[PDB]
Amino acid sequence: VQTAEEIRDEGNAAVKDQDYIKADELYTEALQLTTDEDKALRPVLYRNRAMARLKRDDFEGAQSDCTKALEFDGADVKALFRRSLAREQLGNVGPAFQDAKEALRLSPNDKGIVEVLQRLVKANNDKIKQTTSLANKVTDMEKLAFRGEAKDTEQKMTALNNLLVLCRESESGATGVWNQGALVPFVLNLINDASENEEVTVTAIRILDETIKNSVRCMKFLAMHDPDGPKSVRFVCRLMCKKSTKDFVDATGILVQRVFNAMAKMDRQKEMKPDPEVAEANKIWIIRVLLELQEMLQDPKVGAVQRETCIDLFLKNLMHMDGGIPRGWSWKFVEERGLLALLDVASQIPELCEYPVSAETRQHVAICLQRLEEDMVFDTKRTIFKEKVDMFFNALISRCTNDDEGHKYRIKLSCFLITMLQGPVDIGINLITNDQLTPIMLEMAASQDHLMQGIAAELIVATVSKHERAINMLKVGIPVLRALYDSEDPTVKVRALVGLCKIVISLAKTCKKFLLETEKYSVDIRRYACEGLSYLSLDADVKEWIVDDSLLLKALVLLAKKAGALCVYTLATIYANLSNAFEKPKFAKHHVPETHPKDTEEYVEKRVRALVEEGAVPACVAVSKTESKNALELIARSLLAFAEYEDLRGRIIAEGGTVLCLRLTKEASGEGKIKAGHAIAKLGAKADPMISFPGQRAYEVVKPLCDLLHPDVEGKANYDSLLTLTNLASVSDSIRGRILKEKAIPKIEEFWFMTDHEHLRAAAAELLLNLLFFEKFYEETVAPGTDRLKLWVLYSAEVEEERLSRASAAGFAILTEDENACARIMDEIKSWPEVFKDIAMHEDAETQRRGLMGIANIMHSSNKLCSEIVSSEVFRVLVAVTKLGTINQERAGSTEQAK
């Protein structure tokens, strides 16, 4: 077992290790174990968890825990302190102060409480006179946005936009725009108007959006649409139906996302697992949302988009082992009607469906079903899960008669399998190794029902698998394909080419004739045209062949620029393979297979260069909208390996590179995130930070290439991450601001304490110059007492190379502008004269100019230093004759400091 006690310390240590994420979890986990028989052991936990939360900016959480602590002992000074600091952040300075106050008189002396009250004072002081100022900024915009007191589109759009801007701007900016819930109606009014533009509604929605990240605001939003709770939940979930446009549905699904988040204290985009305590509490609401969202899984009135969204909704919030709801939910989902209904959607294609579905609707059911099974974990459960799918596989099969009516039940039982095979494949496989499915297979394969014919090839093609055990229904199946191929119905030839493709160049000759025939053949046809071509690209010869023909790339682009997520796993794999983006664990021979000059040396560039000249990227963006995993991982490797040719990044940057990889980081899975970053770090460096990371784009572009240095034990693109991070911290302070807070420098510093890495140090150099190029970290490298200064002076000197000078030297002058500075040097820098002399007339131009200007202002402020003319005075003179150089300025500068 794991005692309630010890688990707690395990957390307090987590705090001390500075990984507050674990602490939070550990403390809640700790809390779990104890209940209302350990009384006291709880309050202490809440009082603790709150520090953690407080550190991961979970103010609403911090607050909850504190008051949760005081519930026990109103004196808990640690509670009252943090609860104030929480409220303080929540823009709720009011009772914020009266908490940081009453806190003080419980521990009169505490540099801490004090530093807060001082702040909370200039707070209540500017309080009122400051709120009413926003109240007017609000109203004036509210006036032009919703209350139609505006003329012309644009004008109304910017009001809404500013409203959105001010909305996220701060914690108050939100509360302000929320305007006590007066924002909701105004937004519902736009949703409800048939004639208002999508961009308007979308925006208006995103405003209402942010305002409900607040657990309390959100929960009041969910229950405020009807006096009857259940009905009120319906309304919200159903909003996504009001309109059919893509962006609208999406922007609305998030509102439902928020509801989940708020319902169980969780946010997947923050690695905030749910807090069981909250979730348990307001379960009555979880239930209803689940139920309402479940019911519309099959509601025929509920469209296709909403349909797919409602699926992703479960794939992000039900799967307790994937940042979703807490454990116990997904089980009650399968143990009732959740899985069955989710299953009924599996066996549903456009052509034959009982409720609107689209080509894409499949993926959304696959992954979700995959992960649903993954979220089963126990044994007793993996049982009730397969045990249910089984029951469903029977009921279905045992109704596959041989009549126009019963044919349908074979199309069902069929797709129910293609699906279950791209998803929880294992449960799928174990379903077809029941040769009671091979007859039906054959039957339809042979029928004259063009549909049944095609979706049979697709059923074995989707069985190609890898190993054996099921090579049974392939024994006969594969040949079946060979026949079905001859067919004159495109839809049956193409669907057949695959599989017979995923198992020589004649296949490749065909997949081309489909794809190039852009106008003629259709979309869903060329989808498989791609899928086939996909598997072929793994061979070198094919790799070089493809990139050789323009049209095929020109059309393979038009295919994504129209199909999207339908051609991802596939289109990625074509570009992934075509650019060699996968990896390998790096008598005798085999230095020959490594050949295929088209998979080796400079051939990669012949392809990469070519792919890029034909969209390539715009395509990646087009099909990158998938709650996939590996699919992203491919666009990642594909974009990483795209930007590594210089004059190339100068375009991919303009084709939405940055924006995408950025997404890839948050979104992509595992090594995917990693690859994304490197790609960015490598995209930016020998390129202007302005013409790449504009409009606050630059902020998010940090957490990544700061988490990638951590693994600094050697390797990676640390050098690429630096040349950008440097070129990044150059312009703007908000930049350097984040770079710092990131707890990043305690690491970047180590790219300074190195020997033979002449390059990985010239980086940290040019970086740390622009990193202290303004406060916060300027006074942090001068007073404290960290040997820092030593090198900034030692480096302008230790010149045998270069850059490490000009850098740590340009940072010698601009740094000397401080007096307290010359104080830590001249008295701790034993042997400074030699060093000074070195840099004195050092032969590295700019270094004897930045070096001298650095020393020329050390004696220009503080006489006890100017008096130190030991050999120094020499240079100053010498440098004043014919050197032609300008080092005479920083030289004749050391002069004036003698009067």
Partner: peptide
């Protein structure tokens, strides 16, 4: 005497 920002 334990300045804040340290848990017990």
């Amino acid at each position: 005497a334990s300045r804040m920002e340290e848990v017990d």
